[PDB]
């Protein structure tokens, strides 16, 4: 199985948030970028982070992604009054019992 | 709404739904009607919940037929509810 552990996923999300502009859909350029903006004794992890980072970049192009902020790229009532409300029989009956009386711009449908 | 009920003075809405023995003061559900026979127009006082073979003196025509509850007046009969 090739499930990415939470350590890989969390680092990938942090890389995407901080360096979104420097990333594209190519693994190899993304891997080169990540090796400069990441300190990690394991090259296997950095390769996995680059793989999941370019996966997130693909997903971001296809709409939003949960866990990624990117906070660089992150009256109709008057119209209805003019056209009338057309309240129900019982609703109209309630209005007739009010102190203000039946409001204008309403009908019995 | 906003009108909390008073037990001494119930609302006509709630009190009207009470069973006759569950009202604040119990009372009858029945009444009397003066019924005009469909043959002679003689006025006869008929109980609303009559159960015993009401006959109009004269024609001897059955004015009402007993039912489980209120009596059923004969067809084409003139009745008016009497006061009290």
């Amino acid at each position: 199985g090739k499930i990415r552990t939470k350590t890989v996923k969390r680092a990938s999300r942090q890389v995407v948030e901080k360096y979104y502009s420097k990333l594209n859909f190519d693994f190899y350029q993304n891997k080169r970028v990540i090796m400069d903006v990441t300190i990690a004794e394991s090259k296997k992890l950095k390769n996995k982070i680059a793989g999941y980072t370019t996966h997130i970049m693909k997903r971001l192009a296809r709409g939003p992604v949960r866990g990624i902020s990117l906070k660089l790229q992150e009256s109709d009532v008057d119209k209805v009054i003019q056209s009338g409300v057309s309240v129900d029989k019982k609703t109209m009956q309630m209005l007739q019992r009010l102190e203000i009386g039946v409001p204008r711009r309403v009908k019995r449908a | 709404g906003f009108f909390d009920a008073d037990l001494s003075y119930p609302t006509v809405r709630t009190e009207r739904m009470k069973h006759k023995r569950r009202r604040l003061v119990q009372g009858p559900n029945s009444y009397f009607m003066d019924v005009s026979c469909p043959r002679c127009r003689q006025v006869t006082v008929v109980y609303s919940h009559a159960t015993t073979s009401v006959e109009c003196k004269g024609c001897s025509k059955k004015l009402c037929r007993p039912t489980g509850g209120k009596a059923l007046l004969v067809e084409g009969c003139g009745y008016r509810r009497k006061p009290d």
């Binding site: 007739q96 019992r97 009010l98 102190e99 | 906003f2 009108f3 909390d4």
Partner: protein, 87 residues
């Protein structure tokens, strides 16, 4: 208010609040009893500096009857109007 000595000391530690709906003493451990302050409004729509505050016991807020209790209290206080005026 509270217990009093023969000489006249107040003796009691404190005087607990009483629920404005059921007059029950509001204990120090219920944690569901609330205080609601309603702003007083002058002749103009703006609010004054004073407020009207009512205390509701926790158990009433558990039974779901706190809304009904507040309605009754607010009506008695002359803050809320039972029925709409005549048309």
């Amino acid at each position: 208010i509270g217990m009093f000595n023969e000489e006249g000391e107040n003796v009691d530690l404190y005087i607990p609040r009483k629920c404005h709906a059921t007059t029950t003493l509001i204990e120090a451990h219920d944690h569901a009893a609330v205080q609601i302050s309603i702003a007083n409004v002058g002749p103009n729509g703006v609010i004054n500096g004073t407020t009207t505050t009512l205390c509701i016991a926790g158990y009433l807020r558990s039974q779901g009857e706190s809304d009904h209790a507040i309605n009754h209290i607010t009506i008695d206080r002359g803050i809320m109007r039972i029925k709409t005026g005549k048309p």
